[PDB]
Design a protein around this ligand. Sequence first.
Ligand SMILES: CCCCCCCCCCCCCCCCC[C@@H](O)O[C@H](CO[C@H](O)CCCCCCCCCCCCCCC)COP(=O)(O)OCC[N+](C)(C)C
Ligand SMILES: NC(=O)C1=CN([C@@H]2O[C@H](COP(=O)(O)OP(=O)(O)OC[C@H]3O[C@@H](n4cnc5c(N)ncnc54)[C@H](OP(=O)(O)O)[C@@H]3O)[C@@H](O)[C@H]2O)C=CC1
Ligand code: SF4
Ligand code: SF4
Ligand code: SF4
Ligand SMILES: [Zn+2]
Lengths: 144, 208, 386, 156, 176, 115, 63, 96, 342
Amino acid sequence: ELVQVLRRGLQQVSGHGGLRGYLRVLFRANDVRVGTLVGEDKYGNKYYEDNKQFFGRHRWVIYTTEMNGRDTFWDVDGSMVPPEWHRWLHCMTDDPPTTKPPTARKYIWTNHKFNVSGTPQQYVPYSTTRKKIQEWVPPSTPYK
Amino acid sequence: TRPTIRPRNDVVHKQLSAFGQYVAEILPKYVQQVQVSCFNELEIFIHPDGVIPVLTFLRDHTNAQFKSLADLTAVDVPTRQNRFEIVYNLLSLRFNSRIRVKTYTDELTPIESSVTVYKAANWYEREIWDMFGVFFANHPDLRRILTDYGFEGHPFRKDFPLSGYVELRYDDEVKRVVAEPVELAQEFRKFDLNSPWEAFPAYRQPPE
Amino acid sequence: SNLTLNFGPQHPAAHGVLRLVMELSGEMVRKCDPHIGLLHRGTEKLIEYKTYLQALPYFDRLDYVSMMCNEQAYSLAVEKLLNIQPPPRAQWIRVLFGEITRLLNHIMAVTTHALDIGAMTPFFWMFEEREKMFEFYERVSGARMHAAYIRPGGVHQDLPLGLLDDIYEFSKNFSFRIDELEEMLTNNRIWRNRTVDIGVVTAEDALNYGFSGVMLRGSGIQWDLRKTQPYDVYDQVEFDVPIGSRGDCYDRYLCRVEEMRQSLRIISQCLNKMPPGEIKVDDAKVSPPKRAEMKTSMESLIHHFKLYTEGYQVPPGATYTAIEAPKGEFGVYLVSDGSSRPYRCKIKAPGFAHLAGLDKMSKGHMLADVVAIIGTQDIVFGEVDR
Amino acid sequence: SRGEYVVAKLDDLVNWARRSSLWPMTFGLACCAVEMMHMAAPRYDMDRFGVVFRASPRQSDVMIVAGTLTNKMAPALRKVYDQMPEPRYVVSMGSCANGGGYYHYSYSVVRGCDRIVPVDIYVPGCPPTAEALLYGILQLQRKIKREKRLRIWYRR
Amino acid sequence: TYKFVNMREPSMDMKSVTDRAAQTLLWTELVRGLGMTLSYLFREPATINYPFEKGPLSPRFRGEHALRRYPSGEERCIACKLCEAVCPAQAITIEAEPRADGSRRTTRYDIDMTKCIYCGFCQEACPVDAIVEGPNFEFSTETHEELLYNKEKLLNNGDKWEAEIAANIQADYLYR
Amino acid sequence: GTSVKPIFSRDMNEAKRRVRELYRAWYREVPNTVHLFQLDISVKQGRDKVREMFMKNAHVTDPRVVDLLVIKGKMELEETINVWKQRTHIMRFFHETEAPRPTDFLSKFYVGHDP
Amino acid sequence: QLIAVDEKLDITTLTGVPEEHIKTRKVRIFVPARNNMQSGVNNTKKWKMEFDTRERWENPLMG
Amino acid sequence: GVRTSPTGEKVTHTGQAYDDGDYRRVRFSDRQKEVNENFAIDLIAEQPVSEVGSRVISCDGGGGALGHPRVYINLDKETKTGTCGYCGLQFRQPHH
Amino acid sequence: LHHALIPHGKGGRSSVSGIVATVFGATGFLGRYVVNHLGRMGSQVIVPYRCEPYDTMHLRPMGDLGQIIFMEWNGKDKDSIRKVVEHSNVVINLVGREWETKNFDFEDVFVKIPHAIAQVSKEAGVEKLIHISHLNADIKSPSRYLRSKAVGEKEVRAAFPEATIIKPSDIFGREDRFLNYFASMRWFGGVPLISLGKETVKQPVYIVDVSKGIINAIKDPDAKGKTFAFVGPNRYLLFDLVQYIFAVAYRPFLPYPLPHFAYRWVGRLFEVSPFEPWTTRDKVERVHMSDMTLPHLPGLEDLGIQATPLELKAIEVLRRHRTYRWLTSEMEDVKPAKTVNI
Ligand SMILES: CCCCCCCCCCCCCCCCC[C@@H](O)O[C@H](CO[C@H](O)CCCCCCCCCCCCCCC)COP(=O)(O)OCC[N+](C)(C)C
Ligand SMILES: NC(=O)C1=CN([C@@H]2O[C@H](COP(=O)(O)OP(=O)(O)OC[C@H]3O[C@@H](n4cnc5c(N)ncnc54)[C@H](OP(=O)(O)O)[C@@H]3O)[C@@H](O)[C@H]2O)C=CC1
Ligand code: SF4
Ligand code: SF4
Ligand code: SF4
Ligand SMILES: [Zn+2]
């Protein structure tokens, strides 16, 4: 029984792409589990499943190392997940976007964006309405 | 009329009317009115001088035994000469009943404190004094309970503005929290929601 | 001269916003003076400026450990004033989620009391169950705690198609968690020494000081609102009321644990007896119509418009409606003037009366005893301060 | 250059040590603190990130304003913030702490804790979920990682 | 119907007194508590690996607001101001006027997210499913001003989260 | 008799005597307040502030109103003595941060519309 | 016993209102006029007291 | 359908843009102005007009209960199409 | 007046004052007070900063939402200056250092930077410029600080002819280097004074007075191209001033005379610090130099400011330097110092 769990650990080491891949996933995700690859994102994220872990650990994402413009080898966050995989990953549905793709609309963003707070791309509020009162303009010609 | 309408209970209505008559008979000196609502709640309107007697009766009489003071509060009605209305809600565990006693006062007339009858009143009366400015005579310790230290005015009064008169901020010149006249980036937007058509004909008032 | 000490508001055992001014002789407590209002938000005055539907989330935020119960009390008051009746399935849903809310509140109370006394471990064990119940809340409403699910005509939406099974799965296992908690605390001599004969209150003093709920039943007073004045369907469920004998912290702890067990019993009964039908009163002048009717029917659209802009009018009157909330007797004195906005709303919270009596219970006790007494009263200052 | 490389490395080390050991003051006000309690619960386990509550402000690195700030409480909040040794950070949790929320027009409520103390991260919600607060805490960590104190000192 | 919780007295048998004395002298209850802690030590923890794993959610979840469109790309909002009237926090501000084509459309649609209580009354009131509460909850900012949303920001939120908002609506509109 | 009952005092003389008692208590308390709260004001400044606060209600002629004012002043003193108030509360009496509002017509006309 | 106060009722010093909002305020007491868009008369029964309109300006942020 | 202001600022679909002398543009320095790129008026203008063989048509915006309240449009005028007051879709009878 | 800039409100936090002010050196001693006063009335404040943004946190609660905007800038880059002054109608210059770093000397922070600011503001359409110099600034002083101050003052005047120049003298306040500097030398046993400080006269001025004077000069139409001197109501001998400082702090006063060369040598020794120096040679020169008297210049009383005497404000700075025994002592207990008044 102990030798079986040791073999399972060795299999986990081997199944991540050798020692380099094992160390990469251990230092990035703080986890070394192996699951079936559900899908691959448009931005490089990978989504894995394993139904033998309990509810909460049965789905996970390994984030990409390079999002729109920044290096996300170390700095990753939850806002990097596109909305379809956002629905799959938070267990709002049992259908991955690979098997049940979302509806296509011309106005839907073709490029997901993470939380851009603290960057030059941050949203700045302003009044969207036009000027209420128009002032009289004096004539350009002298009066006397 | 069955599914969507709350059912009636005439037995409780009769019992509450009988007990209201009983209380009015026993205390003619202070009882001014007795009512039973359509959902079986007994209300007793009394003169302000009968707060201590009536409550004591309701707590100590063998047939009343209203041992619990559920709630004590005030209501502000500016159109009345006696602006403030003092409401006592009492619970009787022996007879599994609830009663309500109402009296009145204004800004300058003190109300006798009921701490001797009910200990629970001690904070409630304080709260009334804090929120409406009704003074309670012979209170063991009557002071503000809910508002900030040095707060001026009584917020639960109807003429008190919703956002108050002062607001707080930290000032670095004096290195402390300061109070300034209130200023709002967005003023509260008052809505006129009342319909110009009558809703309940049963409550129509004589047109003078 | 005694030492004067500020206990809180920034204190782990002060529950956030309590300023207990204590006069101490050594460590003996000579006087307790609770300064409150550090969480006074002026809820009642704000309610005076909203419609009846708009005032509902305030009751969520009142006692933020028992949300559906506050919603239920407010809804019962408004239904009594409106002379309407919720449908039976709505009442069963209300009682089920009220019992779940009682479980949540009792977990929070017992675990925080143990943490204050020093037992840090059961907090983590029971907050996972609290998380699962938050999941139930979110599945039924979309919010983990501030649901606003219970409305003055019934409930907002129907249960999702797989929720009853998950509730049954949680309930069939919660008893072992209670058993582990009791193994941790019930027979421990340190726990008993910290709690036995601490904060002893007599039955008469409890009645006069305005106590309610466990604060009464620990002294031997055989009282419970769900048994004596049942409101929704509580007359159709069988459960037992735990009664104390010594009036101290230990008896109240035992009463709360047994009340968790009885809530499990009631939850089982509600799960078995859930009936079919509609979830809100079939009166479109009070409850909004369905979205499909609002987009097809002229009357439905008009009533949707008027209900979500002005609201329904409540006939003039005044009521006092009380329920057996997990912390005691939670009441609303509601005054309507015939309009679509409440004229006056006074909230009666058991924490107010229980805290007003902390000085009486703390006489002849030490600082740690006062910490235990604060823990045993189950005080949340959102409802105390309002 | 050689000195700038050294100060950059020291900046990295100091920022890593500061962001990996964030000790919030055991400070909560209202409903939101309950969700904060769920962040320390086993499911999320803020301890596993290096985040532990400590009662004394002198032993705290971050203040999380979780709940409504009333006019009565504002001096106390300012006092416990001033006694925090530097560097110190403030996280605003929920609508009430952000801008007043459901009591923005009340007479006794401070319209946003940024009137009292400077705020680093604004976590929105009523209440924010424990995941939302965890996201805010990790965002604060990423902000701390971005600060360059010794680089700026060296260029003075 | 009531039961007693603490009305049991113990047996005075010599052997029972001996067990009580042994418990007092040898601390058997404390060993039982230690055993409970030890049994918990060898269980699997309930911790999830955030942010690589997320807590479960529901289609009914209320989070960051968004303004939606019709399939043609036309905005759904018609400036009825029902959401503005129902908002318990007065967090919505609306200004409208006839558009260049005569359509009834807003010129200002602002939501103060530091006033919003995230109750979802606005999306219940809306007759055309224009304003919704989305599934996003990870939108913490570094400044207060970033949480004062205008119409451009809300329309961008709708365009960004539509693929998920529509699917969530599809799974719950039959309960509404 | 106008059917009005007193709070404590029956005529203006008793109300005036209660006012004098409260004023004496405040005058005695001022130095202790300055020392305990560590205020940057003189004892003379605090006593002048007390005198100003008392003179702000010098126009009252109703004994009941004077009684309620004395009761409120007693609560204020009890708050100050027990250190329930903080330095911020005590210093709110002076309005150090508020910019003085001009009182003449021309300045009001220049700044805005308020009378 | 009664003390027979024969003065004019004045609670100004007890309400805590700043003196600016007592002396320079002008209130209007009136029965509101019927909304000319509807024929209902239920909003013209009671008397209303309101205050004089003061200055409203535009917020530099968000307008 | 975004256009550029003479100062270089993007113009929103509501038509708002700060003037050259307006100091409030300073809020966009070192940052950006948020402008939604999809203009609803231009998007709805691209939809073809629907030919129907009845005097009165019905519109619910599509999707059944997921659209807008159902309304009925008269199409008796031959010089102008019938427009939905919610969706903006245009309907007409066969002419010419 | 550009309608968007027309004043509105009651002068509070949410009001509009019509002022768009770029405050250089707002992260300093005087800058925090100036920004606080500007944000009190509801002014749009633009803070150019070069330090770590953490060091600007205290400036954030000083304004309403959107009324304080922080932008990065470089002193030697004119594009940064143009970026930060493009939309402003007032520019205030509070940049200065009491020591020379390896990157900026006295003529870099007092001549080059003020001249660049003034020139870019003039060519960007800025209407009002406020420049802070020293009271004792002149091109023949033994202090390089004051010589650079005078050169920069004349260069700023050349670049911005209608600029307002303000010349304070020894500002004292909570975060000052005047009262704190003399209170902190108790740790060296004695107090070294040149000629026992019996031949030096100082006229310190309150920080709040200087900030109020700057704010008043902003909204004074007649103060376009004038030069102001901001001095306190009382002139003290250095010995009497330091003795009063030690009396308020309740510390033992043990002064001793130190020759000029020895004190200059200790200043040079302390100058070697890679951090902020405890004292410098220039600091020694400025401390033991008498304050100039310029009666022909307008003062605080011409801007409506009544200068606050040191006696009413020394306790708020020096109470931090007391021990626990004397921590609660009052203000009028310390017998105000002797004044060399006329
Ligand atoms: C001699 C006494 C003084 C110095 C004492 C030093 C003691 C030993 C040094 C400690 C070693 C630890 C530092 C490096 C650990 C960083 C690990 C790595 O992952 O960090 C990444 C980046 O690396 C760090 O930025 C580098 C930090 C240190 C850089 C160089 C170290 C300089 C040491 C020189 C000390 C000499 C001083 C001598 C004084 C006399 C980003 O990780 P991060 O994402 O955030 O956290 C994990 C979260 N996940 C899950 C999202 C991935
Ligand atoms: N304090 C006094 O006694 C009186 C002051 N003086 C003058 O008054 C002005 C302000 O006084 P004070 O507040 O006390 O000075 P401080 O030293 O306290 O602050 C100086 C300000 O100027 C900035 N600054 C300094 N050097 C540079 C630089 N090379 N590049 C960019 N910014 C820089 C600082 O920014 P950072 O924090 O990033 O370094 C800081 O914000 C100064 O010009 C001073 O010369 C007039 C008479 C005396
Ligand atoms: S934001 Fe909402 S949940 Fe949080 S404290 Fe305020 S009211 Fe309570
Ligand atoms: S969720 Fe509630 S508070 Fe927020 S905008 Fe909608 S209605 Fe208003
Ligand atoms: S979002 Fe919906 S409810 Fe609000 S104004 Fe637009 S259409 Fe009306
Ligand atoms: Zn349509």
